[PDB]
Amino acid sequence: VDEQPLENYLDMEYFGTIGIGTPAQDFTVVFDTGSSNLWVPSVYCSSLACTNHNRFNPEDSSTYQSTSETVSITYGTGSMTGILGYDTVQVGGISDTNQIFGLSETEPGSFLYYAPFDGILGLAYPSISSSGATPVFDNIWNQGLVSQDLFSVYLSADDQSGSVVIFGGIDSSYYTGSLNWVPVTVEGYWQITVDSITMNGEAIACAEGCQAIVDTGTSLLTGPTSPIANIQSDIGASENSDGDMVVSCSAISSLPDIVFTINGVQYPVPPSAYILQSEGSCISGFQGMNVPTESGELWILGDVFIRQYFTVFDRANNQVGLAPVA
Numbered sequence: 033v034d035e036q037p038l039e040n041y042l043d044m045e046y047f048g049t050i051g052i053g054t055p056a057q058d059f060t061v062v063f064d065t066g067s068s069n070l071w072v073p074s075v076y077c078s079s080l081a082c083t084n085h086n087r088f089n090p091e092d093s094s095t096y097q098s099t100s101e102t103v104s105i106t107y108g109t110g111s112m113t114g115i116l117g118y119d120t121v122q123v124g125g126i127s128d129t130n131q132i133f134g135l136s137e138t139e140p141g142s143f144l145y146y147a148p149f150d151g152i153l154g155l156a157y158p159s160i161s162s163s164g165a166t167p168v169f170d171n172i173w174n175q176g177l178v179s180q181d182l183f184s185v186y187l188s189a190d191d192q193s194g195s196v197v198i199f200g201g202i203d204s205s206y207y208t209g210s211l212n213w214v215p216v217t218v219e220g221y222w223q224i225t226v227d228s229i230t231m232n233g234e235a236i237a238c239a240e241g242c243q244a245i246v247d248t249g250t251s252l253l254t255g256p257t258s259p260i261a262n263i264q265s266d267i268g269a270s271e272n273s274d275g276d277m278v279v280s281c282s283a284i285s286s287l288p289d290i291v292f293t294i295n296g297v298q299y300p301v302p303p304s305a306y307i308l309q310s311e312g313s314c315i316s317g318f319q320g321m322n323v324p325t326e327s328g329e330l331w332i333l334g335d336v337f338i339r340q341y342f343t344v345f346d347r348a349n350n351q352v353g354l355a356p357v358a
Contacts, residue, residue, distance in 0.1 A: 033203065034178060036124030038063060038195035040188050043308070044251045046195055046335065047149040051122035052133070053093030059086045059150040063197050064249035065185075065222055065345065066332075067154035068161035069105055070121070070168050071112060071134030079136075081110075081144035088135055095120050103134035103163045107152075108250075110143035112136045116165055123153070123168060124199050126177050132165050155183070155197075155248075155345065160220040169347070172199065181348040185248055186357065187339045207342035207355035214295050216350040218327055221245035224352060226331060227293040229263075236266055236290075243327050244292075246343060246352055250334030253306060257320035263290070267307070269316045279307050281314045292337075299354065305340050 038046045039060070047062045052072065059072045073087040090096045097118035104113040114136040121128040136151075154167055161167055166174075173181050178200025186206040188194045202211075214224045226244045228235045237259035255263070264270075267287055269277040279287075287303035306317045317336040322329060344353035 033201035034124045034126050034199040036063070036197045036199070037193070038187070038197065040191050040193065040195050041148055043190050043335065043339075045148060046187055046248060048123075048153075048197070050153065052088055053090075053119050054095045055092070056122050057086070057088055057092065059088070060148070061151045061153040062149050062249060063153050063155060063185075064247070065155045066245060066247040066249040067105075067107070067152060068156045068158060068167040069103065069134060069154045069163075069165050070131070070152070071103065071105060071114065071136060072151035073139065074114060074135035074137065077114070077136045077138060079139040079144075080142050081139040081147070082136065084145065085150045087150075090117065090135070093119055097130075099132075101163065103165060105134065105162050110139065110141050110147075112139045112144075114138070116163065121168065123172075124197065126172060126199065128168060128172050128177065129175065131168060131171050133168075134165065152249075156221050157219045169199070173347070182344060182346040184342065184344040184353075185338065186342055187248065187335060189339055202344055202353075206358060208358045209355055211342075211344060211353040211355045212295070212297050213346070213349075213351045213353050216352065217243060218325075219350060221247070222345060222352055223327075223330075224294060227295070230291045230293070231263075231266055232288050237263055238331065242329065242331055243325070244331040244333050246338065246345075247332050247334050248338055250332045251336070252317045252319045252332075252334050253301070253336040254319050254321050254323075254332035254334060256322050256329040256331070260318050260320040263318050264316060267303075267316060267318075269318075277316045277318070279314045279316055281309065281312070283307075284314065292333075294354070299337075299341065301337060301340055306336055308336075
C-alpha cells in the first residue's frame, strides 16, 4: 500500500508531486492512464511553457545517466520533443531506481503554458509508449518494488483532498460493496467493452457495444460526435452563444441517470456527476471527439466516470476493477 496523494484541481485536473535526481528535484505531474511515457521540462527547453514551469537540471543529479536517444510525444493538445535519460524517481514513497524518462527541449504552443503541471506520468501499457520507453509502473514492478502488479485510483469530488493512486494495493475503505472485474480488450490504453448506454431503460447510444478507455487524464465523458449529440438533447443541453452545452441548473434535480452496462453490470452516472456546475451555470460533462482506432470509434470514461467509481488497474490479469465510491 504505497500511496501518492493527488491535488484535485477544479475537478478538471489531477496531478501529484514526484521527485527526480538525487537530491530529488520536485515536479507536479499528471497521473495519466491514457499515456505511458514519463517526461518533465528540462533546463534545455525555452518554449513558452518552459519559462513558468519546473525544469529538470541534469547537472545537479549525481545519479543521472544520459543517452543518445530522443523522445517525441504528441498529446491530445500540445506536444513535447526531447531526449531520454536515466535517474531515480521518487513516486508515492517508492525509490524507482533506473527510471528512463523524457526531458523536454521544446514544448510548442501555449496550452502547456496554461497547464498547472510540469509534466505527465503515464500509466497505460508499454505498447503505446513513444520510443519504447519503459513506463514507471512497469519499471517499478520489474524490480520488485511493489508486491502486486496492480494499482488503484480514487478521485475526490469538487476540489476535496484525498485523491490517491495506490501502487500494488487496493484499499477497501475507498469504495462500498464488491469489485467487478472487466477484462481489457486491447492492451495499450486501458480499453474495455461497454455493452450499451441506456437512459430510462432505452439504449440512447452505443447499443451494439463499443470500446472505451479508462482515462484519469481526460476530464469529461467523451464519445463519437453523433451519439453524444443524442445524449446532449436527452439531457436538455443546448449550445449557447459561446459554443457551450449548457443545461439549466434547475434541471439537475429532475434528470435521470445515464447508465453504462460494462460486462453485464450496470454502472449509473447521476445528473449530479454529468452536469458540472461552473460559476452559477451548469455545463454538461459529455464532449464529442471522434477517435478512430483500428477497433473503431473510442469513448473515454474520463474523470466524470472515474470520480464515481473506485478503479483498480490490474496489470497482473489485464482487467480493471470497478466499485462505487464511499
